[PDB]
Enzyme design. Structure first.
Site, PDB file in Angstrom:
ATOM      1  N   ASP A 148       0.921  -1.219   0.025  1.00 58.07           N
ATOM      2  CA  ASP A 148      -0.025   0.038   0.113  1.00 58.07           C
ATOM      3  C   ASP A 148       0.819   1.173   0.014  1.00 58.07           C
ATOM      4  O   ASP A 148       1.867   1.206   0.677  1.00 58.07           O
ATOM      5  CB  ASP A 148      -0.974   0.115   1.322  1.00 58.07           C
ATOM      6  CG  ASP A 148      -1.751   1.146   1.276  1.00 58.07           C
ATOM      7  OD1 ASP A 148      -2.395   1.524   0.445  1.00 58.07           O
ATOM      8  OD2 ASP A 148      -1.608   2.037   2.336  1.00 58.07           O
ATOM      9  N   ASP A 193       0.952   4.996   0.896  1.00 62.62           N
ATOM     10  CA  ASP A 193       0.635   6.184   1.293  1.00 62.62           C
ATOM     11  C   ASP A 193       1.356   7.584   1.274  1.00 62.62           C
ATOM     12  O   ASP A 193       2.114   8.016   2.346  1.00 62.62           O
ATOM     13  CB  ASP A 193       0.456   5.933   2.940  1.00 62.62           C
ATOM     14  CG  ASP A 193      -0.481   6.972   3.679  1.00 62.62           C
ATOM     15  OD1 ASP A 193      -0.807   6.907   4.854  1.00 62.62           O
ATOM     16  OD2 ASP A 193      -0.729   8.055   3.116  1.00 62.62           O
ATOM     17  N   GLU A 236       1.615  10.994   1.089  1.00 56.39           N
ATOM     18  CA  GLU A 236       0.966  12.101   1.718  1.00 56.39           C
ATOM     19  C   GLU A 236       0.941  13.356   0.953  1.00 56.39           C
ATOM     20  O   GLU A 236       1.681  14.226   0.895  1.00 56.39           O
ATOM     21  CB  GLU A 236       1.509  12.459   3.215  1.00 56.39           C
ATOM     22  CG  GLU A 236       0.583  12.813   4.329  1.00 56.39           C
ATOM     23  CD  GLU A 236      -0.455  11.424   4.574  1.00 56.39           C
ATOM     24  OE1 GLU A 236      -0.876  11.438   5.459  1.00 56.39           O
ATOM     25  OE2 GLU A 236       0.019  10.605   3.998  1.00 56.39           O
ATOM     26  N   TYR A 283     -11.451  11.604   5.882  1.00 53.61           N
ATOM     27  CA  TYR A 283     -11.562  12.062   7.350  1.00 53.61           C
ATOM     28  C   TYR A 283     -10.330  13.234   7.356  1.00 53.61           C
ATOM     29  O   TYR A 283      -9.654  13.648   6.612  1.00 53.61           O
ATOM     30  CB  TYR A 283     -11.091  10.677   8.323  1.00 53.61           C
ATOM     31  CG  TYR A 283      -9.882   9.954   7.995  1.00 53.61           C
ATOM     32  CD1 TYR A 283      -8.547  10.267   7.845  1.00 53.61           C
ATOM     33  CD2 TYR A 283     -10.208   8.665   7.422  1.00 53.61           C
ATOM     34  CE1 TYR A 283      -7.700   9.567   7.481  1.00 53.61           C
ATOM     35  CE2 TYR A 283      -9.390   7.755   7.113  1.00 53.61           C
ATOM     36  CZ  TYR A 283      -8.060   8.176   7.016  1.00 53.61           C
ATOM     37  OH  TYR A 283      -6.886   7.227   6.598  1.00 53.61           O
TER      38      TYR A 283
END
EC number: 3.2.1.14
Length: 539
Positions: free
Chosen positions: A288, A290, A292, A367
Protein backbone atom coordinates in the site's frame (compact mmCIF):
# COMPACT_ATOMS: atom_id res chain seq x y z
CA UNK A 1 16.91 -59.24 12.55
CA UNK A 2 16.30 -55.53 12.01
CA UNK A 3 18.58 -52.99 13.74
CA UNK A 4 18.08 -51.78 17.30
CA UNK A 5 15.90 -48.76 18.09
CA UNK A 6 18.01 -45.57 18.32
CA UNK A 7 17.41 -42.67 20.69
CA UNK A 8 17.54 -39.08 19.45
CA UNK A 9 20.08 -37.03 21.40
CA UNK A 10 19.36 -33.83 23.27
CA UNK A 11 19.86 -30.70 21.21
CA UNK A 12 18.21 -27.66 19.67
CA UNK A 13 15.16 -28.50 17.53
CA UNK A 14 14.26 -24.98 16.34
CA UNK A 15 15.50 -23.84 12.91
CA UNK A 16 14.66 -21.18 10.33
CA UNK A 17 14.75 -20.78 6.55
CA UNK A 18 14.76 -17.01 7.03
CA UNK A 19 17.03 -16.06 9.92
CA UNK A 20 16.50 -13.04 12.15
CA UNK A 21 18.99 -11.48 14.56
CA UNK A 22 16.94 -10.84 17.70
CA UNK A 23 19.55 -8.34 18.89
CA UNK A 24 20.11 -6.43 15.64
CA UNK A 25 19.17 -2.76 15.32
CA UNK A 26 20.08 -2.29 11.66
CA UNK A 27 17.78 -3.76 9.03
CA UNK A 28 20.73 -5.07 7.00
CA UNK A 29 21.81 -7.19 9.99
CA UNK A 30 18.25 -8.00 11.08
CA UNK A 31 17.35 -10.67 8.51
CA UNK A 32 19.00 -13.16 6.15
CA UNK A 33 16.99 -15.16 3.62
CA UNK A 34 18.26 -18.67 2.90
CA UNK A 35 16.99 -21.15 0.31
CA UNK A 36 16.59 -23.76 3.04
CA UNK A 37 17.18 -24.29 6.75
CA UNK A 38 20.22 -26.25 7.94
CA UNK A 39 18.93 -28.90 10.33
CA UNK A 40 21.09 -31.21 12.41
CA UNK A 41 20.13 -34.36 14.32
CA UNK A 42 22.16 -36.81 16.42
CA UNK A 43 21.35 -40.19 17.98
CA UNK A 44 22.60 -43.01 20.20
CA UNK A 45 21.84 -46.75 20.37
CA UNK A 46 22.24 -48.67 23.63
CA UNK A 47 20.60 -51.96 22.63
CA UNK A 48 20.90 -53.94 19.41
CA UNK A 49 22.85 -53.66 16.17
CA UNK A 50 23.26 -50.18 14.63
CA UNK A 51 22.35 -51.59 11.22
CA UNK A 52 24.04 -50.69 7.94
CA UNK A 53 22.29 -47.51 6.80
CA UNK A 54 20.91 -44.61 8.83
CA UNK A 55 18.04 -42.43 7.65
CA UNK A 56 16.29 -39.30 8.87
CA UNK A 57 12.52 -39.24 8.38
CA UNK A 58 10.31 -36.15 8.42
CA UNK A 59 6.68 -37.22 8.82
CA UNK A 60 7.62 -40.61 7.41
CA UNK A 61 9.44 -39.08 4.44
CA UNK A 62 13.18 -39.71 4.03
CA UNK A 63 15.22 -36.50 4.21
CA UNK A 64 18.69 -37.94 4.69
CA UNK A 65 20.55 -41.24 4.45
CA UNK A 66 24.05 -42.41 5.25
CA UNK A 67 26.26 -45.30 6.42
CA UNK A 68 25.53 -46.39 10.00
CA UNK A 69 29.14 -46.91 11.09
CA UNK A 70 28.67 -46.50 14.83
CA UNK A 71 26.27 -46.89 17.75
CA UNK A 72 26.03 -43.09 17.73
CA UNK A 73 25.70 -40.69 14.81
CA UNK A 74 25.01 -37.24 13.47
CA UNK A 75 23.18 -36.09 10.35
CA UNK A 76 23.16 -32.67 8.69
CA UNK A 77 20.52 -31.90 6.07
CA UNK A 78 18.40 -29.10 4.64
CA UNK A 79 14.67 -28.41 4.84
CA UNK A 80 13.30 -26.04 2.19
CA UNK A 81 9.73 -25.97 3.49
CA UNK A 82 8.57 -24.50 6.78
CA UNK A 83 6.40 -26.18 9.39
CA UNK A 84 6.44 -28.56 12.35
CA UNK A 85 7.83 -31.99 11.50
CA UNK A 86 7.73 -35.27 13.41
CA UNK A 87 11.37 -36.25 12.99
CA UNK A 88 12.67 -39.80 13.36
CA UNK A 89 16.01 -41.56 12.98
CA UNK A 90 15.74 -44.97 11.34
CA UNK A 91 18.44 -47.63 11.27
CA UNK A 92 18.15 -50.19 8.48
CA UNK A 93 19.80 -53.43 7.38
CA UNK A 94 19.00 -56.41 5.15
CA UNK A 95 16.27 -57.49 7.58
CA UNK A 96 14.49 -54.13 7.70
CA UNK A 97 14.33 -50.75 9.41
CA UNK A 98 13.72 -49.72 13.02
CA UNK A 99 12.52 -46.15 13.61
CA UNK A 100 13.07 -44.17 16.81
CA UNK A 101 10.24 -42.40 18.59
CA UNK A 102 9.35 -39.07 16.99
CA UNK A 103 10.96 -35.77 18.03
CA UNK A 104 9.31 -32.58 16.80
CA UNK A 105 11.50 -30.08 14.96
CA UNK A 106 10.40 -26.63 13.88
CA UNK A 107 11.49 -25.10 10.58
CA UNK A 108 10.35 -21.48 10.61
CA UNK A 109 9.56 -19.39 7.55
CA UNK A 110 8.08 -15.91 7.18
CA UNK A 111 4.75 -17.28 5.97
CA UNK A 112 3.95 -18.53 9.46
CA UNK A 113 3.82 -22.17 8.34
CA UNK A 114 5.58 -23.15 11.59
CA UNK A 115 3.09 -21.34 13.83
CA UNK A 116 -0.29 -22.53 15.12
CA UNK A 117 -3.23 -20.32 14.01
CA UNK A 118 -3.65 -17.12 16.02
CA UNK A 119 -7.38 -17.48 16.74
CA UNK A 120 -8.30 -15.02 19.49
CA UNK A 121 -11.70 -14.28 20.98
CA UNK A 122 -13.26 -10.93 20.09
CA UNK A 123 -12.73 -8.26 22.75
CA UNK A 124 -14.69 -5.27 24.05
CA UNK A 125 -17.89 -4.60 22.04
CA UNK A 126 -16.70 -6.41 18.89
CA UNK A 127 -19.28 -8.83 17.44
CA UNK A 128 -18.61 -11.68 14.93
CA UNK A 129 -19.31 -10.90 11.25
CA UNK A 130 -18.92 -12.96 8.08
CA UNK A 131 -17.16 -11.43 5.06
CA UNK A 132 -19.82 -12.37 2.53
CA UNK A 133 -20.77 -8.96 1.13
CA UNK A 134 -17.93 -8.90 -1.37
CA UNK A 135 -17.09 -5.41 -0.13
CA UNK A 136 -13.80 -4.18 1.30
CA UNK A 137 -13.59 -3.90 5.09
CA UNK A 138 -10.17 -2.71 6.18
CA UNK A 139 -8.31 -0.98 8.95
CA UNK A 140 -4.81 0.19 9.77
CA UNK A 141 -2.78 -1.31 12.60
CA UNK A 142 -0.02 0.93 13.99
CA UNK A 143 3.43 -0.53 14.67
CA UNK A 144 4.10 1.73 17.67
CA UNK A 145 0.63 1.08 19.07
CA UNK A 146 2.01 -1.88 21.01
CA UNK A 147 3.66 0.44 23.52
CA UNK A 148 1.58 3.18 25.16
CA UNK A 149 -1.70 2.14 23.53
CA UNK A 150 -0.77 -1.46 24.38
CA UNK A 151 -2.73 -2.67 21.33
CA UNK A 152 -1.21 -5.83 19.86
CA UNK A 153 -2.00 -8.03 16.87
CA UNK A 154 -3.79 -10.55 19.11
CA UNK A 155 -6.29 -7.81 19.96
CA UNK A 156 -7.28 -7.23 16.33
CA UNK A 157 -10.81 -8.44 15.45
CA UNK A 158 -9.29 -9.99 12.31
CA UNK A 159 -12.37 -12.01 11.36
CA UNK A 160 -14.25 -8.75 10.76
CA UNK A 161 -11.73 -7.49 8.22
CA UNK A 162 -10.90 -8.28 4.61
CA UNK A 163 -7.82 -6.05 4.59
CA UNK A 164 -5.31 -5.24 7.34
CA UNK A 165 -2.70 -2.55 6.60
CA UNK A 166 0.44 -2.22 8.76
CA UNK A 167 1.70 0.77 10.80
CA UNK A 168 3.92 2.17 8.03
CA UNK A 169 7.10 0.87 6.52
CA UNK A 170 9.60 3.73 6.15
CA UNK A 171 11.89 4.62 3.25
CA UNK A 172 15.56 5.05 4.21
CA UNK A 173 17.10 8.51 4.19
CA UNK A 174 18.56 11.02 6.63
CA UNK A 175 18.89 14.79 6.40
CA UNK A 176 17.04 16.24 3.42
CA UNK A 177 15.19 12.95 2.85
CA UNK A 178 13.15 12.36 6.01
CA UNK A 179 13.22 15.78 7.70
CA UNK A 180 9.54 15.45 8.63
CA UNK A 181 10.40 12.72 11.14
CA UNK A 182 12.43 15.24 13.12
CA UNK A 183 9.15 16.67 14.42
CA UNK A 184 8.64 13.43 16.36
CA UNK A 185 10.87 12.88 19.40
CA UNK A 186 13.58 10.34 18.58
CA UNK A 187 11.73 9.12 15.49
CA UNK A 188 14.31 10.38 12.99
CA UNK A 189 17.14 8.85 15.01
CA UNK A 190 15.29 5.53 15.16
CA UNK A 191 15.13 5.35 11.36
CA UNK A 192 18.82 6.24 11.13
CA UNK A 193 19.64 3.23 13.32
CA UNK A 194 17.42 0.94 11.26
CA UNK A 195 18.96 2.22 8.03
CA UNK A 196 22.56 1.90 9.25
CA UNK A 197 24.68 1.05 6.22
CA UNK A 198 21.59 0.86 4.01
CA UNK A 199 21.14 2.88 0.80
CA UNK A 200 18.80 5.87 0.76
CA UNK A 201 15.42 5.24 -0.85
CA UNK A 202 15.33 1.56 0.05
CA UNK A 203 12.60 0.50 2.47
CA UNK A 204 13.28 -0.72 6.00
CA UNK A 205 11.45 -1.32 9.28
CA UNK A 206 11.13 1.77 11.49
CA UNK A 207 11.11 -0.08 14.85
CA UNK A 208 12.77 -3.53 14.52
CA UNK A 209 12.00 -4.30 18.16
CA UNK A 210 8.26 -3.80 17.95
CA UNK A 211 8.19 -5.45 14.53
CA UNK A 212 10.11 -8.66 15.27
CA UNK A 213 11.72 -8.83 18.71
CA UNK A 214 9.17 -7.84 21.39
CA UNK A 215 7.60 -10.93 22.98
CA UNK A 216 3.88 -11.17 22.18
CA UNK A 217 1.15 -13.80 22.58
CA UNK A 218 1.94 -16.81 20.41
CA UNK A 219 5.59 -15.86 20.03
CA UNK A 220 6.95 -15.54 23.57
CA UNK A 221 9.71 -18.17 23.68
CA UNK A 222 13.13 -16.65 24.28
CA UNK A 223 14.40 -18.48 21.20
CA UNK A 224 11.44 -18.06 18.82
CA UNK A 225 12.79 -16.74 15.45
CA UNK A 226 10.06 -14.20 14.65
CA UNK A 227 8.35 -12.28 17.46
CA UNK A 228 6.68 -8.87 17.73
CA UNK A 229 4.05 -7.69 15.23
CA UNK A 230 5.45 -9.64 12.28
CA UNK A 231 5.48 -12.86 14.27
CA UNK A 232 1.87 -12.44 15.29
CA UNK A 233 0.79 -11.35 11.80
CA UNK A 234 2.32 -14.61 10.57
CA UNK A 235 0.20 -16.65 12.98
CA UNK A 236 -2.77 -14.44 12.11
CA UNK A 237 -2.43 -15.36 8.42
CA UNK A 238 -2.50 -19.02 9.47
CA UNK A 239 -5.85 -18.40 11.16
CA UNK A 240 -7.21 -16.16 8.41
CA UNK A 241 -5.66 -17.34 5.10
CA UNK A 242 -8.03 -15.08 3.15
CA UNK A 243 -7.16 -11.94 5.12
CA UNK A 244 -5.09 -9.54 3.04
CA UNK A 245 -2.21 -8.11 5.06
CA UNK A 246 -0.53 -5.17 3.40
CA UNK A 247 2.52 -3.17 4.40
CA UNK A 248 1.78 0.56 4.14
CA UNK A 249 4.70 2.68 2.99
CA UNK A 250 4.55 6.31 4.02
CA UNK A 251 2.07 8.15 6.18
CA UNK A 252 2.20 11.78 7.31
CA UNK A 253 5.80 11.77 8.62
CA UNK A 254 7.34 9.20 6.24
CA UNK A 255 6.27 10.60 2.85
CA UNK A 256 9.17 13.01 2.21
CA UNK A 257 11.12 10.42 0.17
CA UNK A 258 8.36 10.06 -2.45
CA UNK A 259 8.95 13.65 -3.62
CA UNK A 260 12.35 12.51 -4.93
CA UNK A 261 10.86 9.56 -6.85
CA UNK A 262 10.96 11.77 -9.94
CA UNK A 263 14.47 10.37 -10.29
CA UNK A 264 14.08 7.01 -12.08
CA UNK A 265 17.26 5.76 -10.42
CA UNK A 266 15.77 6.28 -6.96
CA UNK A 267 12.36 4.98 -8.00
CA UNK A 268 13.88 1.77 -9.39
CA UNK A 269 15.90 1.25 -6.19
CA UNK A 270 12.74 1.74 -4.15
CA UNK A 271 10.67 -0.71 -6.21
CA UNK A 272 13.56 -3.15 -6.03
CA UNK A 273 13.66 -2.91 -2.23
CA UNK A 274 9.91 -3.52 -2.09
CA UNK A 275 10.20 -6.75 -4.09
CA UNK A 276 13.00 -8.05 -1.88
CA UNK A 277 10.90 -7.08 1.16
CA UNK A 278 7.91 -9.11 -0.01
CA UNK A 279 10.23 -11.98 -0.91
CA UNK A 280 11.58 -11.87 2.65
CA UNK A 281 8.34 -11.34 4.59
CA UNK A 282 6.04 -13.84 2.85
CA UNK A 283 2.99 -13.10 5.00
CA UNK A 284 2.44 -9.76 3.22
CA UNK A 285 0.05 -9.83 0.24
CA UNK A 286 1.28 -6.78 -1.62
CA UNK A 287 1.93 -3.14 -0.87
CA UNK A 288 0.00 0.00 0.00
CA UNK A 289 1.41 3.40 -0.93
CA UNK A 290 0.52 6.24 1.43
CA UNK A 291 2.22 9.18 -0.26
CA UNK A 292 1.00 12.09 1.81
CA UNK A 293 -0.39 14.14 -1.04
CA UNK A 294 1.56 14.30 -4.29
CA UNK A 295 2.14 17.97 -5.12
CA UNK A 296 2.94 19.06 -1.58
CA UNK A 297 0.72 20.36 1.22
CA UNK A 298 2.04 17.49 3.31
CA UNK A 299 4.16 17.56 6.46
CA UNK A 300 7.08 19.20 4.62
CA UNK A 301 6.41 22.76 3.37
CA UNK A 302 9.49 22.58 1.16
CA UNK A 303 8.44 19.63 -1.00
CA UNK A 304 5.94 19.16 -3.80
CA UNK A 305 5.97 19.78 -7.55
CA UNK A 306 3.59 19.74 -10.54
CA UNK A 307 5.53 16.66 -11.63
CA UNK A 308 4.40 14.53 -8.65
CA UNK A 309 1.25 13.48 -10.48
CA UNK A 310 3.24 11.92 -13.31
CA UNK A 311 5.65 10.35 -10.81
CA UNK A 312 2.74 8.79 -8.90
CA UNK A 313 1.27 7.12 -11.98
CA UNK A 314 4.68 5.86 -13.08
CA UNK A 315 5.32 4.50 -9.58
CA UNK A 316 2.04 2.57 -9.49
CA UNK A 317 2.66 1.12 -12.95
CA UNK A 318 6.23 0.11 -12.09
CA UNK A 319 5.15 -1.45 -8.79
CA UNK A 320 2.41 -3.43 -10.54
CA UNK A 321 4.99 -4.65 -13.08
CA UNK A 322 7.25 -5.71 -10.21
CA UNK A 323 4.33 -7.55 -8.57
CA UNK A 324 3.52 -9.31 -11.85
CA UNK A 325 7.19 -10.29 -11.97
CA UNK A 326 6.95 -11.67 -8.44
CA UNK A 327 3.70 -13.51 -9.19
CA UNK A 328 5.49 -15.39 -11.97
CA UNK A 329 8.11 -16.46 -9.44
CA UNK A 330 5.82 -17.42 -6.55
CA UNK A 331 2.53 -18.07 -8.30
CA UNK A 332 0.77 -15.96 -5.68
CA UNK A 333 -1.54 -13.01 -6.30
CA UNK A 334 -0.50 -9.60 -4.96
CA UNK A 335 -2.49 -6.42 -4.40
CA UNK A 336 -1.44 -2.81 -4.99
CA UNK A 337 -3.34 -0.12 -3.10
CA UNK A 338 -2.92 3.47 -1.93
CA UNK A 339 -4.35 5.82 0.69
CA UNK A 340 -5.08 9.21 -0.89
CA UNK A 341 -6.35 12.64 0.09
CA UNK A 342 -10.12 13.04 -0.19
CA UNK A 343 -9.70 16.69 -1.08
CA UNK A 344 -10.64 17.55 -4.65
CA UNK A 345 -7.73 20.01 -4.80
CA UNK A 346 -5.25 17.20 -4.13
CA UNK A 347 -7.16 14.59 -6.14
CA UNK A 348 -6.96 16.74 -9.27
CA UNK A 349 -3.17 16.63 -9.04
CA UNK A 350 -3.17 12.97 -10.04
CA UNK A 351 -4.58 11.05 -13.01
CA UNK A 352 -6.29 8.31 -11.01
CA UNK A 353 -8.33 7.35 -14.07
CA UNK A 354 -5.02 6.03 -15.38
CA UNK A 355 -3.34 4.84 -12.17
CA UNK A 356 -6.41 2.80 -11.24
CA UNK A 357 -5.45 0.32 -13.96
CA UNK A 358 -2.46 -0.77 -11.88
CA UNK A 359 -4.24 -0.66 -8.52
CA UNK A 360 -6.66 -3.01 -6.77
CA UNK A 361 -8.06 -0.50 -4.29
CA UNK A 362 -7.98 3.22 -3.54
CA UNK A 363 -8.35 4.04 0.14
CA UNK A 364 -9.99 7.48 0.14
CA UNK A 365 -8.92 9.26 3.33
CA UNK A 366 -12.32 10.82 3.96
CA UNK A 367 -11.33 12.06 7.41
CA UNK A 368 -9.21 14.77 9.05
CA UNK A 369 -11.19 17.31 7.01
CA UNK A 370 -11.01 19.63 10.03
CA UNK A 371 -8.98 19.63 13.23
CA UNK A 372 -6.90 21.56 15.77
CA UNK A 373 -4.50 22.34 12.93
CA UNK A 374 -6.95 25.14 12.05
CA UNK A 375 -8.42 27.11 14.95
CA UNK A 376 -10.38 29.48 12.69
CA UNK A 377 -12.33 27.35 10.21
CA UNK A 378 -14.11 24.60 12.14
CA UNK A 379 -16.18 21.76 10.70
CA UNK A 380 -16.99 18.05 10.52
CA UNK A 381 -13.73 16.09 10.22
CA UNK A 382 -15.22 13.06 8.47
CA UNK A 383 -18.82 13.88 7.48
CA UNK A 384 -20.47 12.45 4.39
CA UNK A 385 -22.05 15.68 3.16
CA UNK A 386 -21.76 19.41 3.83
CA UNK A 387 -23.58 20.85 6.88
CA UNK A 388 -26.75 22.95 6.65
CA UNK A 389 -24.93 26.08 7.82
CA UNK A 390 -22.44 25.70 4.96
CA UNK A 391 -23.64 23.67 1.94
CA UNK A 392 -20.62 24.90 -0.02
CA UNK A 393 -18.19 22.95 2.18
CA UNK A 394 -15.49 21.53 -0.08
CA UNK A 395 -13.95 18.91 2.21
CA UNK A 396 -16.66 16.24 2.41
CA UNK A 397 -16.65 12.51 1.67
CA UNK A 398 -19.03 12.90 -1.27
CA UNK A 399 -16.96 15.63 -2.94
CA UNK A 400 -13.93 13.36 -2.75
CA UNK A 401 -15.75 10.44 -4.35
CA UNK A 402 -17.30 12.65 -7.04
CA UNK A 403 -13.90 14.12 -7.88
CA UNK A 404 -12.57 10.61 -8.51
CA UNK A 405 -15.65 9.49 -10.44
CA UNK A 406 -15.40 12.68 -12.50
CA UNK A 407 -11.90 11.64 -13.62
CA UNK A 408 -13.14 8.29 -14.86
CA UNK A 409 -12.16 6.13 -11.90
CA UNK A 410 -14.33 3.03 -11.54
CA UNK A 411 -16.63 3.25 -8.47
CA UNK A 412 -15.78 -0.27 -7.28
CA UNK A 413 -12.17 0.84 -6.82
CA UNK A 414 -13.05 3.48 -4.23
CA UNK A 415 -12.95 2.51 -0.54
CA UNK A 416 -14.51 5.13 1.72
CA UNK A 417 -12.71 6.03 4.93
CA UNK A 418 -14.18 6.02 8.42
CA UNK A 419 -12.66 7.36 11.65
CA UNK A 420 -12.24 5.45 14.89
CA UNK A 421 -11.17 8.68 16.53
CA UNK A 422 -12.36 12.23 16.97
CA UNK A 423 -10.62 15.55 16.39
CA UNK A 424 -11.48 18.48 18.61
CA UNK A 425 -10.78 22.02 19.76
CA UNK A 426 -11.04 23.83 23.08
CA UNK A 427 -12.34 27.19 24.26
CA UNK A 428 -14.57 27.39 21.20
CA UNK A 429 -16.51 30.68 21.18
CA UNK A 430 -18.10 33.34 19.00
CA UNK A 431 -20.52 30.87 17.42
CA UNK A 432 -24.06 31.72 16.32
CA UNK A 433 -27.36 29.84 16.06
CA UNK A 434 -26.12 27.32 18.64
CA UNK A 435 -23.68 25.83 16.11
CA UNK A 436 -20.17 25.65 17.67
CA UNK A 437 -18.67 25.02 14.23
CA UNK A 438 -19.38 28.65 13.32
CA UNK A 439 -17.04 30.12 15.92
CA UNK A 440 -13.32 29.90 16.65
CA UNK A 441 -11.10 27.94 19.05
CA UNK A 442 -8.26 28.99 21.35
CA UNK A 443 -6.48 25.66 21.07
CA UNK A 444 -6.72 21.85 20.75
CA UNK A 445 -8.92 19.68 22.96
CA UNK A 446 -7.22 17.42 25.50
CA UNK A 447 -6.32 14.25 23.63
CA UNK A 448 -6.08 10.59 24.58
CA UNK A 449 -2.41 10.35 23.60
CA UNK A 450 -1.72 13.58 21.71
CA UNK A 451 -3.48 16.95 21.67
CA UNK A 452 -6.45 17.41 19.36
CA UNK A 453 -7.14 13.69 18.94
CA UNK A 454 -9.20 11.27 21.04
CA UNK A 455 -9.83 7.55 20.59
CA UNK A 456 -13.43 6.80 19.75
CA UNK A 457 -13.19 4.45 22.73
CA UNK A 458 -12.67 7.40 25.09
CA UNK A 459 -15.35 9.49 23.41
CA UNK A 460 -17.96 6.80 24.06
CA UNK A 461 -16.87 6.03 27.61
CA UNK A 462 -16.25 9.56 28.87
CA UNK A 463 -17.82 12.18 26.62
CA UNK A 464 -21.33 10.72 26.38
CA UNK A 465 -22.42 11.94 29.81
CA UNK A 466 -21.98 14.83 32.22
CA UNK A 467 -22.11 18.34 30.77
CA UNK A 468 -21.42 16.98 27.28
CA UNK A 469 -24.02 17.87 24.66
CA UNK A 470 -24.62 15.29 21.93
CA UNK A 471 -25.91 16.09 18.46
CA UNK A 472 -26.17 14.04 15.27
CA UNK A 473 -26.09 16.19 12.12
CA UNK A 474 -28.48 14.27 9.86
CA UNK A 475 -27.67 16.61 6.97
CA UNK A 476 -23.91 16.04 6.83
CA UNK A 477 -24.32 12.66 8.57
CA UNK A 478 -21.92 13.28 11.44
CA UNK A 479 -22.05 13.35 15.26
CA UNK A 480 -20.30 15.75 17.64
CA UNK A 481 -20.10 16.48 21.36
CA UNK A 482 -19.80 19.92 22.93
CA UNK A 483 -19.06 21.15 26.46
CA UNK A 484 -20.24 24.80 26.70
CA UNK A 485 -18.40 25.45 29.97
CA UNK A 486 -14.92 24.79 28.56
CA UNK A 487 -15.88 25.20 24.92
CA UNK A 488 -14.65 21.70 24.05
CA UNK A 489 -15.86 20.43 20.67
CA UNK A 490 -15.20 16.99 19.18
CA UNK A 491 -16.04 15.74 15.68
CA UNK A 492 -15.91 12.00 14.94
CA UNK A 493 -17.79 9.04 13.39
CA UNK A 494 -20.31 6.92 15.29
CA UNK A 495 -22.41 3.84 14.59
CA UNK A 496 -24.97 5.89 12.63
CA UNK A 497 -22.56 8.05 10.63
CA UNK A 498 -20.79 4.84 9.62
CA UNK A 499 -24.15 3.31 8.69
CA UNK A 500 -24.65 6.29 6.37
CA UNK A 501 -21.27 5.71 4.74
CA UNK A 502 -21.98 2.01 4.30
CA UNK A 503 -25.35 2.62 2.69
CA UNK A 504 -23.71 5.28 0.52
CA UNK A 505 -21.13 2.72 -0.62
CA UNK A 506 -23.80 0.16 -1.49
CA UNK A 507 -25.95 2.68 -3.37
CA UNK A 508 -23.07 4.04 -5.45
CA UNK A 509 -21.56 0.57 -5.74
CA UNK A 510 -18.23 1.64 -4.25
CA UNK A 511 -15.44 -0.69 -3.14
CA UNK A 512 -16.08 -0.69 0.59
CA UNK A 513 -14.96 0.92 3.84
CA UNK A 514 -11.65 1.18 5.69
CA UNK A 515 -10.72 2.77 9.01
CA UNK A 516 -7.77 4.47 10.62
CA UNK A 517 -6.28 3.26 13.91
CA UNK A 518 -7.93 -0.10 14.65
CA UNK A 519 -6.65 0.30 18.21
CA UNK A 520 -8.86 3.33 18.89
CA UNK A 521 -12.19 1.53 18.37
CA UNK A 522 -14.18 -0.26 21.09
CA UNK A 523 -15.96 -2.30 18.43
CA UNK A 524 -18.90 0.01 17.66
CA UNK A 525 -17.23 1.34 14.52
CA UNK A 526 -16.05 -1.87 12.90
CA UNK A 527 -19.35 -3.57 13.76
CA UNK A 528 -21.19 -0.78 11.91
CA UNK A 529 -18.77 -0.92 8.99
CA UNK A 530 -19.54 -4.63 8.63
CA UNK A 531 -23.29 -4.38 9.20
CA UNK A 532 -23.78 -1.36 6.94
CA UNK A 533 -22.05 -3.18 4.06
CA UNK A 534 -24.30 -6.21 4.34
CA UNK A 535 -22.02 -8.71 6.08
CA UNK A 536 -23.97 -11.42 7.89
CA UNK A 537 -23.65 -11.74 11.66
CA UNK A 538 -21.45 -14.68 12.60
CA UNK A 539 -21.87 -17.23 15.38
Amino acid sequence: AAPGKPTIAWGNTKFAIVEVDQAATAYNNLVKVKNAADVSVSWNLWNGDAGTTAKILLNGKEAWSGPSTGSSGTANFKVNKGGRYQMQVALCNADGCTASDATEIVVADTDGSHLPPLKESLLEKNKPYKQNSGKVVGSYFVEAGVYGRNFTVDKIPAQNLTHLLYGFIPICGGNGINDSLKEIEGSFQALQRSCQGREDFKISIHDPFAALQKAQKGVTAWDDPYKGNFGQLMALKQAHPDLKILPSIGGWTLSDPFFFMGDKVKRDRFVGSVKEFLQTWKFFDGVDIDWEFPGGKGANPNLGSPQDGETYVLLMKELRAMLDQLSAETGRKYELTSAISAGKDKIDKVAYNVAQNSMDHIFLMSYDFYGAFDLKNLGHQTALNAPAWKPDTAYTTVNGVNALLAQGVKPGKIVVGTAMYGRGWTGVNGYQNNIPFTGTATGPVKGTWENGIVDYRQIASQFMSGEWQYTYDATAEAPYVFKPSTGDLITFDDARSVQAKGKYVLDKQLGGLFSWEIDADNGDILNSMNASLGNSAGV
